[PDB]
């Protein structure tokens, strides 16, 4: 790769500069290079990887939705062509994330935090592919997303407290999957309500170093329930 000659520590250092500069493609490239060194990522580095690629794919999703709306409201080839161009780029980024996850990041080893986070990430980027899929791809993409989320859920309930931010964020994203991709509003509402209530019931498990993240997700769970009720 293009980062092959750079030292891992310099790659991490430059990902953090790129974040400060709001250069999120660069930041994603630097973090990809870091991952390709073959060593496990720390919690801080997993955040860099997550923040970089989510920012990249987020801009592509927002663009795709704008163009898709124009495309359907006009129901010339230009809008469809340009929508397909953004769509192909988005799929290319999701393929890159999913390839890093399978080639390098997901393992049977490592602690449960890391294993859950990568399976949640795998579920997310299959979900992003599913937002733009149609046919024999779409059915199988949704199953790959649900499969990855479910394995992450099983591990998280067994190994992490109910306020853990990866656990919460995973459960929040699985439920959005249920409501938006799987069209199962009841399965979504059941997961979100259970997740929030169990977090409340074991509120004492909040961690000094992540409680702000936990309470943010709990609120986002409440917001989704209000939307869905």
């Amino acid at each position: 790769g293009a980062m092959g000659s750079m030292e891992r520590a310099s790659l991490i250092q430059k990902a953090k500069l790129a974040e400060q500069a709001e250069r999120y493609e660069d930041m994603a490239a630097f973090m990809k290079g870091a991952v390709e060194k073959g060593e496990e990522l720390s919690c801080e580095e997993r955040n860099l990887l997550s923040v970089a690629y989510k920012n990249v794919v987020g801009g592509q999703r927002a663009a795709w939705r704008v163009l898709s709306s124009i495309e359907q409201k006009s129901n010339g080839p230009e809008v469809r062509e340009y929508r397909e161009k953004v769509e192909t780029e988005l799929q290319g980024v999701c393929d890159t994330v999913l390839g890093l996850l399978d080639s390098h990041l997901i393992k049977e080893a490592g602690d449960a935090e890391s294993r859950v986070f990568y399976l949640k990430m795998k579920g997310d980027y299959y979900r992003y592919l599913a937002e733009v899929a149609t046919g024999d791809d779409k059915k199988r993409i949704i199953d790959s997303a649900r499969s990855a989320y479910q394995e992450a859920m099983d591990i998280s309930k067994k190994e992490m407290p109910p306020t853990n931010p990866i656990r919460l964020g995973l459960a929040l994203n699985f439920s959005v999957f249920h409501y938006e991709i799987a069209n199962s509003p009841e399965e979504a509402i059941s997961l979100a309500k259970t997740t929030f209530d169990e977090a409340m019931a074991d509120l004492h498990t909040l961690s000094e170093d992540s409680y702000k993240d936990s309470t943010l997700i709990m609120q986002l769970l409440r917001d989704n329930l209000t939307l869905w009720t």
């Binding site: 997550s50 923040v51 989510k54 994203n173 959005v176 409501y179 943010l216 989704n224 939307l227």
Partner: peptide
């Protein structure tokens, strides 16, 4: 109004 997923932080 769309569903809210996990945001970016930190």
């Amino acid at each position: 109004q769309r569903s809210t997923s996990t945001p970016n932080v930190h």
